Each structure stands twice: as structure tokens, then as C-alpha cells.
Amino acid sequence: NNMNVIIADDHPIVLFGIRKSLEQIEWVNVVGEFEDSTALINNLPKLDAHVLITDLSMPGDKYGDGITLIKYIKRHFPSLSIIVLTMNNNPAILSAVLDLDIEGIVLKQGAPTDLPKALAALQKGKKFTPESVSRLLEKISAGGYGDKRLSPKESEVLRLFAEGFLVTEIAKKLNRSIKTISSQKKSAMMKLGVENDIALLNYLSSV
Amino acid sequence: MNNMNVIIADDHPIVLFGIRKSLEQIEWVNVVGEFEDSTALINNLPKLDAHVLITDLSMPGDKYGDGITLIKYIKRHFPSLSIIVLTMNNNPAILSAVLDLDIEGIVLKQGAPTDLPKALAALQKGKKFTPESVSRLLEKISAGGYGDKRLSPKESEVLRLFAEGFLVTEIAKKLNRSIKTISSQKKSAMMKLGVENDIALLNYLSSV
Amino acid sequence: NNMNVIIADDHPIVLFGIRKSLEQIEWVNVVGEFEDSTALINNLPKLDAHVLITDLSMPGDKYGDGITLIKYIKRHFPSLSIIVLTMNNNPAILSAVLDLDIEGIVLKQGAPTDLPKALAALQKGKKFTPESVSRLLEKISAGGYGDKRLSPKESEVLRLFAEGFLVTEIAKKLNRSIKTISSQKKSAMMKLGVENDIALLNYLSSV
Amino acid sequence: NMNVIIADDHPIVLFGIRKSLEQIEWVNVVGEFEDSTALINNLPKLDAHVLITDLSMPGDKYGDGITLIKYIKRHFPSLSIIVLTMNNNPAILSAVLDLDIEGIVLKQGAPTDLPKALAALQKGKKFTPESVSRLLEKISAGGYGDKRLSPKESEVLRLFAEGFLVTEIAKKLNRSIKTISSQKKSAMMKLGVENDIALLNYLSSV
Amino acid sequence: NMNVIIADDHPIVLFGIRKSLEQIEWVNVVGEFEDSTALINNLPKLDAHVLITDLSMPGDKYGDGITLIKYIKRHFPSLSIIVLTMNNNPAILSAVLDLDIEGIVLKQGAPTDLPKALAALQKGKKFTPESVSRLLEKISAGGYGDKRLSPKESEVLRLFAEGFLVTEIAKKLNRSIKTISSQKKSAMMKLGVENDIALLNYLSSV
Amino acid sequence: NNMNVIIADDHPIVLFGIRKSLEQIEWVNVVGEFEDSTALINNLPKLDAHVLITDLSMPGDKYGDGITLIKYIKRHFPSLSIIVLTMNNNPAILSAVLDLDIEGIVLKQGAPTDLPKALAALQKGKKFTPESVSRLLEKISAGGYGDKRLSPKESEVLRLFAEGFLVTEIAKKLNRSIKTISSQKKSAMMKLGVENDIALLNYLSSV
């Protein structure tokens, strides 16, 4: 079946390569290309397509930036399928994009194979997740904070610290020394990526 | 001042004894129970002739929670009880979290000889007690709960766009500045927030 | 069938009155009597009772005051059926008590047969609402704020005022005089029981 | 330089805005509107992301006042908004600031406030003039007035909300019926409520 | 004058509605549409009070059915909506009424219903025809059907949702396994669920 | 690290088997054995226990039944780790018990191997889920409604039906024959376990 597609990307060289790779798929018909979000949004009403392939970092000063722009397109064009094509390999960005409930994400890194597969899955009404995305979602598998998971003893020490126990009181409670629990705490702070107690306690309110 | 019955709880037996002796020198305060652990405190609360509890944060007990969670538990299960938290913990985020429980007040132990009687007096006049020391520690997280040195408008915008999914290079193009300037404003922002990597920065920014 | 009943009232003559009144009903067995909520709550784990008859003004050092005590009993002893017997005839109080999902309210100003009817309805698995309680609920029939409902014109004036229009600007838009809109505004305020514009705006912010 | 759109339906006030912005070299007015429908319909094509707008603007289509501003915020989220208003009511000004916008400028306030607001916006900062802050002091006690409820007043209201009749509050707090009736009456005046149903609804929110 | 927009992709129905409204002197038809894209794209331009629209209108942009109606409500909040539909499923009609629109008119209901809907709108009131109310009585028992769950059926379902086996329920209630199984079957038939998993999911999300 | 344990079960073969299994572990002490929920709740405050091994369907009505009793125990003794033992092999019950956030579940077949593993997992800090539980959860692996997943075509049909398209109008929308769509709807209704359009729509509204 014939699928009408719109491309939105502000990197001319990437846009060029996407156009060329979609021209070799006979059932894909490109009906628009845009370099900023104002032109994209203002023209979506007049173009017959229900697939948008879009990046995250488009310029424009009306309809929001990045994830907020994708949310905006979703709410204002609810029948439009969205594939996000991005160079952002940060795990927390990718999972936040997947929380929006869109067709799929394609990393520009592994993209020669993935974009045609994403479009194939879309034609069959399925979502697509390439190996290169689920690989990066494993780096936030241990509680959303990293590859090195907190040990059971580290987690208890941070739990008591978040409950209002000072290090000496944590030492007194679990029978270990002050040296031991100081290092179990320091170890845990390094894994979470935090430099002081204020920032540690803030971080633990979230998760 | 009218006569006021009081219950005291602290896991340090020497401090518990000390608190009792200080309060026995005040003729309008009468201590009717002392506890070392939270299990015995909770199990005895139903029978004790008092509705004012002065309590620690670091009590042992394997049953009703510990620290802030234990205080929550006491509030829920004994909602007429007035609670003063008497603690050594000076960490601002712990203090504001205890104040969010909507209790009578916090007394820091270093000021207890004068502030603990003032807390009990404020309770009789139906007002909360927050000593100057506690107010000043709360000022060390006055900028968005993360520190005293606030993010500049330029730093906030860089972080905002980073949270939206802009890479540093794309923020530079967006804001029309160099990659060196954006990288510098980001590094400064991360230091003020006290975060060391991007995963930590983005999890932190999911709160705001 | 027989029914075990606990009574709680902090007025000694009323507590005696209730016990004695129920003494006439052969199938009612009074298994406990309380003057304060602390003794009541401390004995509920031990007593086998289907029903608690209680007022709202009991003194108590521990388990809450009034409605909060009723919530407490409903939460911590979830099989206990509750009849609230109260002198409080304020419609918002009675409404808030009925929202807790109890057997029913009986007024101390009620009919001689109201409390016996409530107990009888409970045996049949049904809630009881006395006629006197229904008439009091009619006093807040119009949106919870009173008996006299806001007119369409009054509501439009308050809407525009809540959205930030001055009375002079409401006159211009609605094509009416300042006197007419002032009068409709003054009328709306009297129906809501509100004395100044700050109170009016805070009231409209909630509902 | 900064392009700007202006929306106000009082030509006298619109001249004062256009006059004071003519004095500022780095501001360009690229759009002027008198109703909200024309404003909203043209925002997609206007070469500006800064709007100076009236609160009480005519317009059948997209809402009125605070609701209109929320509508603009939602449909154009990158737009910075400065609200120009004749309304001096503290609760209204408070509710406009809760929208999270660049700021409010009063028409009655000083003539340099709008230049300052635009200058603040250049630096990424909100602007709140002294005239707005002065008016907000009128609701500094819990958003209901200038005079705070005393501890005794608050306890009386708390017990009333729990279902204690005035007679039972008196027995509970060991005081006369006229004392707590007086404290209740005083509390109701500070909140601005005339009867018990209004009082009890007010206490459910806060 | 009440300006009206009409939207239906069945031409027989679309021209029919035009004729129906031309008989009423104070109604002005300002637009006619066969799809939701053209409808939504022109709503900003057209000055209209009311929209008469069906539920199954084509369009690949702004949503389908109920979602299209919600979309129109959010983005054009002054537009009164009358839904004209051939769908007479009570759960659909109930869900459409929950949107807070002017009304529903069934296409197989009487030919005076649409004029009566427009007349009611002009007086500031909602219109619900008797044919719609009759269909709503088919889900009167808790939104699930005509026949309400008995007290005993509800007791059995309650224990089953708590994790009790039928044999355990029988023991607890001093009844036979067959009696409990029969009360369960009967309850499942009233609810319209065919297996235990569907029953539990149905009971948990309610 | 001596671990004090309470057992709550009214089935004698199961109670005996649990105690016998725990007798073999040197660091385990049984400090309570209860055959009804009221005795259990009344004695929880005065026993020094970290772990509760409890039955899902114990007698006693005072504090709730089943899943509701477990939530009640959780809220009133939040530091108490809970292992639920169950004769109920219904997948939807098991997932609802797991949603309570507890140490784990053991089926009735797991008198020997499952409890020592669960208790070892608990001492180390981790949850435990036996193979026998996982195997039964596979029966609801598709969306919580079964093991036969709705196809994309089926899901698109149901989505349009929930939005208020008649079957005739779904055929026009999707450009398929009415016969194909009726067939797709029927098969989708079978997978969900619903018998009429009202149940289907309520199912699609809620979950």
C-alpha cells in the first residue's frame, strides 16, 4: 500500500540521505520536507499524509522545543503517526520519547536499516524498536540510574539516610563501623552520579 | 502556663535521661513516659495520659517504619497527637521533609535547653515552633531545593533545552553561541545542582 | 436475629438515654458503652459488635475529633457498621458525614422511632435515611452552596468576573448598565454567602 | 532587537503603548490587534514570540480573560506573554501570575514598567513592579485577606469543620458560648463569609 | 440569526439537513463539509454558533468519532455541538453525552428532533430526545445492562475478587458449591463476561 | 542474622509442611502460628517478627478478607515483609497479589523448594518469584486479558468501535468488507472474553 510521508530535519546532509534512502522504497511517497517547526506545523493542515518522520532539535519560536514539540504535534494532529529520528543517544531522553506513545524511535547512528524497518512495521500497524534503542534502554535498567546497580547494602544505607539517619546512627544500627558505611555511601553516591548530601537527598525523593 | 503531660522518645539512653531531667525542672511540664524504641512507643501510645510527643528520628524498631516514615505512621494512627521532632540531623532536605508532615515543630538538639521549652510554650498557644537555626538551614536550599547559589537565566535555559532533548551542539545553534560557552554554562549548572554526569542531570531535571 | 451494639456519647445523660431506649428492643444487646474515643478505640479490637452508635463531639486525646474520628473507625475497623447520632443539623456536616459511607445519620432532634428504624434497616442489609435528614440536605440542593440556585445571568456575570473582567467591562460586553450588573453580582454574592470580591473569587476557584 | 505583538481594545491605552515603545529603539511592533479572534488567527504567521496583551479583550471564539491567556499559552507555548491590565483585584493578579508568564503591568502603575518588563524579558527574568507587589500584600494572609486568623480562631473553625457545634466547642475548650461565638464571628469576617454553609465549603478547599 | 455548520459524509443526509434548516427562518447555514480535515481547517475562518456533525466522518488528521468531538471542544470552546448519529448503542450515546455538548439527535428518530434541538439551544438548554432516553434505560443497572446484580451475586463476586475459590466461598457462606457456581454464572451473564480472567479485570477496573 | 517468622494458615497439611521446611534452616525461628486473621492482627504488635508467611483466604472478618486483608496488614505493619501462600492458581489473582509490592508468592505445591529460596532471597535483599508462578502468569501475558494477543487489525477495529463507529462505518474507514470486520470484531471479543457490545465498550473504557 502507498504511504505518504513528511520529513522534518534541520541538518541538510541528513535530510539529503533520508530523501535518497526513501526514494528506493517504491511504496513510500514523500509529500513534504521542513527545516523548522513553525513551517511544519503551519503546513500539516494542508498536506495529505499521516506519517511524520521528525528530529528533536528543530528551530522555531512558536510551538515548543524537542519533547514538548513532539507532545504538541501529538495533541494537535492525533491521527498523525510520528517516528522520531534523533542523534541523542542519552537513555533518559529516549525513554521520555517512548512515554509519549508514538510509532517509534530510530537512532541516526544505526539508521540505514532501521528507518525502512520502522516504516514497514508502521504499515502493518506495529510499533518498532531497533536493537540500538533497547541496547541503550538497558543503561537505565537498574532503577533508571545506570549500568552498575546498587548492591542490597548500599540501597539500605541510602534508604536510612533518606529517612533521616546520620551516618553514625546508620553505623550504630547495622553494627558496622563508621568507616565502612562512609565508603558504602560514597560508593552509592558515585553510582548515582551525585556530589553532595543535598543533591543525594533530592535525587532519592524522585525514586 | 497550664500543666502539660509529655511523652519522650530517643534511642540514646543518656540523652533520653538528660531530656527527662531538663523537663522535670520545668514545673508546668510532666513527663509520663520514656521510650528507647519505636515498637514500644507505638504499642504504649494508646494507654499513656498525654497528647504531646517529643521524639527522635533514629529510633530502632522493625515494625512501624523508621525515621520520617515512622513520624508519618505516628501522625496517621494517632492524629490528635502533637509531635515535636527533637534531632541532631542538620541536613536541610531532611528538615524540610519533616516540616512537610505538618507537625508542631522541629527542635535541634544543640539549642534544646532553651528551644525545647519554647516549642512546648508555642504549642499551648496553638502555634507552630520553628527556631531561627532551622529557618537558616532552610535558606541553604532556598534556590529550588538544590543550594544557595541560584542557576542564572542562561544556565536554566541551557538545562531546559538539554531536558527537552537538545544535544550541546544543537543548544549552541539554537541559542547562537559557541559550543565552548554552552559547555561552560552547563558545567557550571551541573556543579550548582551537584550532579556529575548526564544521566544524573536528566533524572534530577525530571522532578522540576 | 440478635444484634450486638456499642454506644458512644460524651454526655452521660444522653448515653444512659440511648442505652435505656434500646432496652425496649428485645433483639438489641448492648455490649459496651463509652464516654471518650480513646477508651472506645482501645476496646474495639476486643469487643464483638456489629454496630456502633456514636455522636460527633466526643472528647479524645488520640484518635481524632468528630468526622476525623468517624474516618478513623471506618479505616481501622472496616466491618463495624456506624450510625451517627448527632444534634448537628448543619447540611454540609451531615452531607460530609454521609460521604464517608456509613449505615446512616439519626438526629437527636429526630422522631422517637428513627434510631430503632435505623437498627432495623441495618439487619436487612440496608442504609436508612430519616425524613428529617433529607429535608436538611435540601437546604444545600443548589450546587452545595444553598437552597436558591444562581440564575443564568448571575452565572455569566460571575464567570466573566472570575476570568478578570471589571464590572464596567462586563457592562460593555453584555450590553447592560453598570447598575444591572452590580445588582446581579450583589444577588449572586448573597446566594453564595460571600461578603467581598476576594472571597467570591476564592470560592469560584474551588468549584 | 525584539519583535513584539500588541493586543488591546482601548485606543487611548494602545496609543500609550505604541508611544512608549516608539521611544525604545530595539523594539519593533509587527502586529496590533483589538480582538482575540484576529490575534489568535494571525499568531501562526507573525514574526514575533513576544505578546503584550489586554485581559478584557473582546472576541467570541477562543475564550475570555484568564481562559484566553491559557488558550494562547497552550497553542503557542514558545510565546512570552506580558499582561497589561486595569484590574487591581489581588486575587485576579495572583491568578494571572500562577499562569507562569513574563509578568503583569498595571495601567495605573508607573510609565516605565512596560520598558522594564521588556528589558527583563531580554535577560530571561520575570518582572513584577512594586505596584503589583503592593496590591498582592492585601491577600498575604492565606490568600483571603490582610488580617490573619489567630490560633484560637483557627482552632474554633477546625472544630466546627469536624462537626462540633458552638456549644460543644465551648465545653471542649473550656470557654463561654459568647466567647467562641465572638471568635467564630471574627473568623468569618476575616474570610469574608456570611453564613455557616459558605464557611464550611471554604474550609474544605484549604 | 443562529449561524450553523453542517458536517456529514452521506450526501443524502447532508442535503437533507440543509433543507430541514432552511424551513427555520432564523437559522443561517454558513458551511457544509464532508470530512473533518476541511471542517477543522475552516472553523477558524467561519463565524458559527453551532455545529451539526456525525460520528463517522472521514479525515486522517484530527481524530475519529468521539475523539474528533473532544478535539473540537478543546480547540473551539464557544462552538455548540449537536451530534447527529445512526449509532444507537447505549454505551456510545452515554459516552457522547459525558462530553458536555448540546445534544444527540438520532438519524432514525423523528424529523422534528433537529429543529427541537436548535430551538432548545437558543433558549440556553440541552436537548435530550425521548428516543435517546429510552436507549439509556438499557444500561440503567450500573452501566452494564438491564438486569441489576442481586445482593447475593455481589457478595460472591466480592469474595471472588478478594482471591477466594468457589469452594472456599461455599464454606464461608454455608451454601453448596452448586449454589455458589450458579450465582457466579448468573452474575457473569448479567455483566457479559465469558471467563474468570475477564470477570476479575472487569471487577478490578470499576 | 536470626530471622523471626510468623505463619498464618488454616490448612493443616500446609501449616505442617511450612514449619517442617523452616525447621531445617538454622537461622529461622517461628514465633507465631495463626489460623484466623483476627488472632493474627491482634498479635502482630506484640511479636518480634520480620516476616509473615500468610494464606490468602483465612477465616476472620473483622479486618477484611483476602487481598483486602493483605493491604490492611501492609499499611499497619509497613516494615513487615510478606510472603503470600495460595491455593488459588488464577493468573489474574496472582498478578493482583504481586501488584501489592510484597516479598513474593508461593503456590500450594511449594511446600519444600520454594520457601527456603524465598527466605534466602529475602535475607540477601531481593524478591522471589518461583518458576511455577511465572508459568501461570504466561496465561495472561497479552495485556492481562489472555495469552492470545489482539492483532493490529483487531485493535484498530476495537478502537474505532469505542470511538463510536458502527461496524458498517468501520468497513468504510478501513476499506475492508463488512464480513472481514465482523469476523475481526468477533475474534477480538473472544480473546478478551466479552459476550456483547456493552461489555466490550466498558472493558475498553476502563482498562
Can you give chain A as a three-state secondary structure string? Answer: CCEEEEEECCCHHHHHHHHHHHHCCCCEEEEEEECCHHHHHHHHHHCCCCEEEECCCCCCCCCCCCHHHHHHHHHHCCCCEEEEEECCCCHHHHHHHHHCCCCEEEECCCHHHHHHHHHHHHHCCCCECCHHHHHHHHHHCCCCCCCCCCCHHHHHHHHHHHCCCCHHHHHHHHCCCHHHHHHHHHHHHHHHCECCHHHHHHHHHHC
> Cα separation of A167 and C56, whole Å?
47
Residues paired with A82 in a beta bridge? A52
Report CB contact under 8 Å: A42, D43: no
Torsion over CA: E133, E135, E141, E142 (sign): negative
Helix (H, G, I), strand (E, B) or coil at D205: helix
3-state DSSP call for residue E65? Answer: coil
Cell triple for E191: 455483566
Helix axes A91-99, B198-205, angle to 10 degrees: 30
Q: Does D125 touch chain B (CB under 8 A)?
A: yes
| Residue in the block written with cell 444512659 | C16
Report the distance separating Cα C153 and Cα A172, nearest Å: 70
> Is residue F70 classed exposed, middle or buried when 0-12, 13-18 and 19+ CB atoms within 10 A define those classes?
buried
- Provide the 3-class DSSP secondary structure of residue E9: coil
> Under a CB-based contact definition with an 8 Å cutoff, are residues B8 and B16 in contact?
yes
A interface test, pick of B139, B170, B201, B208 with most A CB neighbours within 10 Å: B170
Asked if D60 and E78 touch (Cβ cutoff 8 Å), the reply is: yes
CB atoms within 10 A of CB B87: 22
What's the Rg (C-alpha) of chain F?
23
CA D152 to chain centre: 31
User: What is the DSSP-derived secondary structure letter of residue B145?
Assistant: T
Which of C201, C206, C207 is best to mutate for the D interface (most D CBs within 10 A)?
A: C201
The count of residues in chain A is: 207
Substitution target in E54, E57, E64, E173 with the highest count of F β-carbons within 10 Å is E64
Contact of E139 with F199, CB cutoff 8 Å: no
Element containing residue F186 per DSSP (H, E): helix F178-192
Pair B149, A51: CB distance under 8 Å: no
Long-range contact set of residues C102-109: C-beta below 8 Å, sequence gap at least 24: C102/C70, C102/C74, C103/C51, C103/C127, C103/C128, C104/C128, C104/C129, C104/C130, C104/C133, C105/C129, C105/C130, C105/C133, C106/C130, C106/C133, C107/C132, C107/C133, C107/C136, C108/C14
Which triple of cell numbers denotes residue B138?
Answer: 532552610
Q: Count how many residues are written for chain D.
A: 206
F155 touches chain A (CB under 8 A): yes
3-state secondary structure A76-131: HCCCCEEEEEECCCCHHHHHHHHHCCCCEEEECCCHHHHHHHHHHHHHCCCCECCH
Of the candidates C109, C113, C105, C102, the residue with the CA atom closest to the CA atom of residue C25? C113
Mutate to test the interface with D, among C14, C68, C163 (most CBs of D within 10 A): C163
Q: What cell was used for C167?
A: 464590572
Provide the grid cell at F150.
489482539
CB contacts < 8 Å between A and B, how many? 132
Closest chain D C-alpha to C125 CA, distance in angstroms: 27
CA pair distance D135, D97, nearest whole angstrom = 13
Task: Tell me which DSSP letter residue D193 carries.
Answer: B
* Cβ of residue B165 closer than 8 Å to a chain A Cβ: yes
Give CA–CA dist B153/B147, Å, rounded.
16
Separation in Å, CA A1 to CA A26, A121, B129, D104, F181: 10, 13, 72, 54, 19
Contacts of A66 (CB under 8 A, 6+ apart): A56, A57, B161, B164, B165, B166
> Torsions phi, psi of C45, nearest 5?
-60, -30
Could you tell me which of D37, D41, D97 has the C-alpha nearest to residue D66?
A: D97
CB E135 within 8 A of CB E90: yes
Is the CA virtual torsion D1, D3, D9, D12 positive or negative?
positive
What is the least distance, in Å, from the CA of F80 to any CA of chain B?
Answer: 6
Helix axis angle, F197-206 relative to F152-162, nearest 10°? 100
* Residue D14, helix vs strand vs coil: helix
Query: Can you give the three-state secondary structure of B78-138, one letter per residue?
Result: CCCCEEEEEECCCCHHHHHHHHCCCCCEEEEHHHHHHHHHHHHHHHHCCCCECCHHHHHHH
E151-204 sits in which CATH class? mainly alpha
Amino acid at E41: N
d(CA D5, CA D29): 6
CA dihedral D75, D78, D83, D89 (to 10 degrees): 70
CA distance C94 to A69: 49
Residues in a beta bridge with D54: D84
Q: Is D26 helix (H, G, I), strand (E, B) or coil?
A: coil
Using CB atoms, pick whichever of A125, A152, A156 lies closest to residue F153.
A125
CA D103 to chain centre: 10
Give the gap in angstroms from C-alpha D116 to the nearest C-alpha of chain C: 24
Extents of the domains making up chain D: 1-140, 141-206
3-state secondary structure of D29: strand
* Cβ <8 Å between A80 and E59: no
Say how far apart CA B205 and CA B166 lie, in whole Å: 14
Interface partners of chain E (CB pairs < 8 Å, 3 or more) are A, D, F
H/E segment holding residue E119: helix E113-122
Picking from F22, F8, F138, the residue whose alpha carbon sits closest to that of residue F85 is: F8
CB contact under 8 A, F79 and B73: no
D49 to chain B, any CB pair closer than 8 A? The answer is no
Separation of alpha carbons E69 and E56, rounded Å: 11
CA–CA distance, F7 with A186 (Å, rounded to integer): 39
Q: What are phi and psi of C34, to 5 degrees?
A: -135, 145
Chains A and F contact (Cβ–Cβ under 8 Å for 3 or more pairs): yes
Alpha-carbon Rg for chain C in angstroms: 23
Phi, psi of D37 (to 5 degrees): -65, -50
- Give the torsion through C-alpha atoms of B127, B133, B134, B137, to 10 deg: 150
Q: How far apart are CA A92 and CA B203, in angstroms?
A: 7
Q: How far is CA D101 from CA B54, D39, D193, in A?
A: 44, 18, 32
Q: State the Cα torsion D10-D16-D17-D23 to the nearest 10°.
A: 160
C and D touch per CB criterion (3+ pairs under 8 A)? yes
Task: Inform me whether the C-beta atom of residue D137 falls under 8 Å from chain C C-beta atoms.
Answer: no
Please give the angle made by the CA atoms of C51, C54 and C55, to the nearest 5 degrees.
160
- Alpha helices by DSSP H, listed for chain C, are 12-23, 37-43, 67-76, 91-98, 114-123, 131-137, 152-162, 167-174, 178-192, 197-206
Q: How far is C40 from chain B (nearest CA, A)?
A: 11
Resolution number, Å: 2.3
Technique used to solve these coordinates: X-ray
Radius of gyration of chain A (CA): 23
Exposure string (b/e) for D160-190, b if CB count within 10 Å is 16 or more? bbbbbbbebbbbbeeeeeeebeebbebbbeb
- Optimal mutation site among D36, D60, D61, D76, interface E, most CBs of chain E within 10 A: D61
The grid cell for A151 is: 548492591
E36 in contact with F, Cβ within 8 Å: no
d(C-alpha A176, C-alpha A170), whole Å: 8
Q: How many CB atoms lie within 10 A of CB B56?
A: 28
Phi-psi region of F149 (alpha: psi -120 to 50; beta: other; left: phi over 0): beta
Residue A203, CA distances (Å) to A195, A196, B187, B202 in order: 11, 11, 18, 11
Q: Which three cell numbers, joined as nine digits, stand for C166? A: 471589571
Q: How far apart are CA F75 and CA F96, in angstroms?
A: 17
C93, three cell numbers:
456536616
Cβ-nearest to B81 among C62, C65, C72:
C62
Closest Cα in chain D, distance from residue C207 (Å): 9
Helix (H, G, I), strand (E, B), or coil: what is residue F108?
Answer: coil
Strands (E), F27-133: 28-34, 51-55, 81-86, 104-107
What does the DSSP assignment read for E19-64? HHHHSSTTEEEEEEESSHHHHHHHTTTS--SEEEE-SS---SSS-S
Whole-angstrom distance, CA of residue D200 vs CA of residue D159: 11
Which of A34, A98, A85, A91 shows the shortest CA–CA distance to A60? A34
Contact A64 D44 (CB under 8 A): no
Rounded CA separation D201/C144 (Å) = 8
Cell readout for B163 is 531536558
Rounded Cα distance between B56 and A165, Å, is: 10
From the number of C-beta atoms within 10 Å of its C-beta (0-12, 13-18, 19+), residue B62 rates as middle
Residue A42 in contact with partner chain B when CB distance is under 8 A:
no
CA gyration radius for chain B?
Answer: 23
What does CATH list as the number for A152-206?
1.10.10.10
Alpha-carbon distance of C9 to C16, in angstroms, equals 9
| C72–chain F Cβ distance below 8 A for any pair | no
Cell 425524613 found at: C131
Architecture of domain B4-140: 3-Layer(aba) Sandwich (3.40)
Distance from the E88 Cα atom to the nearest Cα atom in chain A, whole angstroms = 25
- Count Cβ atoms below 10 Å from residue E111 Cβ, excluding itself: 8
**Rounded-to-integer distance, Cα A23 and Cα A30, Å:** 8
Q: With contacts defined as CB-CB under 8 Å, which chain B residues touch D77?
A: none
Q: Where are the alpha helices (DSSP H) in chain D?
A: 11-22, 36-42, 66-75, 90-97, 113-122, 130-136, 151-161, 166-173, 177-191, 196-205
Alpha carbon C125 to chain centroid distance?
22
> How many C-beta atoms lie closer than 10 Å to residue B57's C-beta?
24
Task: Compute, in degrees rounded to 10, the torsion defined by CA atoms E81, E84, E85, E86.
Answer: 170
- Note the CATH number of domain C3-139: 3.40.50.2300
Chains touching chain C, criterion 3+ CB pairs below 8 Å: B, D, F
SS3 label, residue F185: helix
Nearest to B171 by CA among F53, A66, E41: A66
CATH superfamily of domain region E2-139: Response regulator (3.40.50.2300)
For residue D61 the three cell numbers come to 471564539
Whether chains B and E touch (3+ CB pairs under 8 A) is answered by no
Could you give the CA distance from residue D78 to residue D70 in angstroms, rounded to a whole number? 13
* Greatest extent of chain A over all pairs of C-alpha atoms, in Å: 71
CA-based nearest residue in chain A for residue D42: A42
C-alpha–C-alpha distance, residues A174 and A182, integer Å: 13
Q: CB–CB of B116/B105 below 8 Å?
A: no
> Which CATH fold would you assign to the domain B153-207?
Arc Repressor Mutant, subunit A (1.10.10)
